Structure formats: structure tokens, C-alpha cells
Design a protein around this ligand. Structure first.
Ligand code: AMP
Length: 279
């Protein structure tokens, strides 16, 4: 029961997360965005001012289909123009359950952690709460928390179109299918931002607009049985360094997807329920 027995959220947080100042430009952000695999940059000087997410950065090309000049202008854009200002944060002395509740109820994939003077000291993301499953009973199967009406994309579809769809539906990841509707990969916002970062760095739109999803997608298919525990799902996500697991039909078509967001939702439920069972 020791992961739940931490004095506070400092037990879980990533220290030294990527930070930039409000005076910095998006070019610098494109270089740092995937540092530590966080996928977000805290914007701060003395105090936290904003949070620049992967979505925030991918939105820079939302109204293009994009010149060398356009990419240069993105590169030189002040971070303040795209950051989420006044982000929700937790204090370093605060508890793990409150952080889970915030993320679950208000739909945040990360919380900056700040000290009493509002200075950033760390960050917690969905990934950091996966360790809490080590101390838990096996209560729920993957089937209960997986999503089943899975949005997929065909493997030859343009990456810019993949991005539009992800941003529109609010998914970080789309399983990729072939001619027989079999799953051949997963394209992710991390994939997409790697490519957009290259396009921005080189002022060359081809790195983003010239790619199809099969060119950049994750090709490791990590699957799980829908009757396996959410704890096993969590453990596997930690070991395989991924944020989703696929549930496949016998014919290798998609049945469902379970993500670290789903596992956070489930964890919230487990914790709330263990409050009741002690009654
Ligand atoms: N491609 C997808 N199709 C349908 N649901 C998804 C997809 N990707 C993620 N989800 C679900 O959408 C929610 C957000 O997950 P995430 O994309 O990890 O932030 C979770 O309930 C996931 O199960």
C-alpha cells in the first residue's frame, strides 16, 4: 500500500520537466516538446504562466493545407500566443487523490506541480499514476473501461488529415488499418509533432504534408485480452513505455482500445469505492 501512502504528490511527479519562458518562441518549444516523453511544456518565469501542450502546438497549422514563410512565422511566434494561460496546477504538498480527481473530473492529461509561491517544481501526467496499480487488488477487467467504437484511419492517408481528425475528436491516437480492415499500426500526436517539428526546424513543409500515416506510425502492436485486469494493463503500459493497448478480434480487426486516461478513470473509481467498502 506504499504508493498510496506517500505524503503528497511529490511521490509521483516528474522533477525537472521542460520549462520555457513566456518571451520564448514556438521554435524552441518544437525542439523541447517531447523531452522526458512529457508532451507538455510549462511556461514560467518566477511563477507559472501557462502550459503549452502537444495539441496547442499541433493547432498552429490548423488553418493551413503552408509555405516556408508560414513555417518561419510559426517558429518565431511568441509562446504566449498558443499556450494555455492560467493552467490548473496542484501544490507540491497536496495529495495524490485530489490530483486524480482533478484530472478525471475536468479532463486534464497533466497537472503542473508548484510550490506555495506558484513556482513550478514538477509535473504529473497520466503515466505517473499507473504505478498505483501495483498496490491494488485486481477488481476490474479491461473490458469495462476500454472504448469500443474505435476511430481508425487507413494506412495511406495523409498525416495532416490524421492530425485534423485526432484534434477534432480529442484523441491522442488512432489505430491504423489496411485493405482488410486489419490493424497495422497506431498513429499518434507524438508521431505527428515529431514531423511538424522537423518541418518547422527546416522550413520544409514536406516533412509534415508529404507524409502518409504508414510512414510515421507506431508499428508495434501491443495487445491485451479484454478479460485481463486493468492492473495488468497498467503494468504493461509501464514496461512497454506506451499509453494505450489494443484489444483485437480474432481476425485482427479492432475490438477496443484502452488508454492511460481510461486507467486513470478506473483508478478514481477504485479509490472512491474502497472508501465505501471500509464502511
Ligand atoms: N482512436 C480512438 N477511438 C475511440 N476512442 C478512443 C481512441 N483513442 C482514445 N480513445 C478514448 O478516448 C478517451 C481519451 O483517451 P486519450 O486519447 O488517451 O486521451 C479514452 O476514453 C479512450 O479510450
Amino acid at each position: 500500500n506504499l504508493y498510496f501512502q506517500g505524503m503528497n504528490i511529490e511521490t509521483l511527479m516528474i522533477k525537472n520537466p521542460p520549462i520555457l519562458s513566456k518571451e520564448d518562441r514556438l521554435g524552441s518549444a518544437f525542439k523541447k516538446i517531447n523531452e522526458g516523453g512529457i508532451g507538455r511544456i510549462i511556461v514560467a518565469n518566477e511563477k507559472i504562466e501557462g502550459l503549452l501542450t502537444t495539441r496547442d502546438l499541433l493547432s498552429t497549422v490548423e488553418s493551413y493545407c503552408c509555405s516556408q514563410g508560414d513555417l518561419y512565422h510559426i517558429s518565431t511566434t511568441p509562446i504566449i500566443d498558443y499556450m494555455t494561460p492560467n493552467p490548473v496546477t496542484v501544490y507540491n504538498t497536496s495529495d495524490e487523490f485530489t490530483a486524480i480527481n482533478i484530472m478525471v473530473t475536468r479532463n486534464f492529461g497533466s497537472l503542473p506541480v508548484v510550490d506555495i509561491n506558484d513556482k513550478p517544481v514538477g509535473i504529473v501526467t497520466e503515466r505517473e499514476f499507473l504505478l498505483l496499480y501495483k498496490d491494488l487488488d485486481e477488481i476490474f477487467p479491461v473490458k469495462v473501461f476500454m472504448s469500443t467504437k474505435v476511430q481508425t484511419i487507413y494506412k495511406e492517408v495523409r498525416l495532416d488529415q490524421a492530425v485534423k481528425l485526432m484534434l477534432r475528436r480529442g484523441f491522442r491516437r488512432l489505430p491504423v488499418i489496411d485493405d482488410d480492415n486489419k490493424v497495422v499500426g497506431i498513429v499518434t500526436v507524438v508521431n505527428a509533432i515529431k514531423q511538424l517539428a522537423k518541418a518547422v526546424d527546416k522550413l520544409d513543409p514536406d516533412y509534415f504534408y508529404g507524409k502518409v500515416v504508414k510512414d510515421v506510425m507506431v508499428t508495434n502492436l501491443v495487445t491485451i485480452d479484454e478479460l485481463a485486469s486493468v492492473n495488468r494493463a497498467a503494468a504493461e503500459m509501464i514496461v512497454k513505455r506506451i499509453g494505450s493497448l489494443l484489444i483485437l478480434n480474432k481476425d485482427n480487426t479492432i475490438r477496443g482500445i484502452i488508454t492511460e486516461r481510461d486507467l486513470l478513470i478506473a483508478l478514481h473509481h477504485i479509490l472512491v469505492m474502497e472508501k465505501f467498502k471500509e464502511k
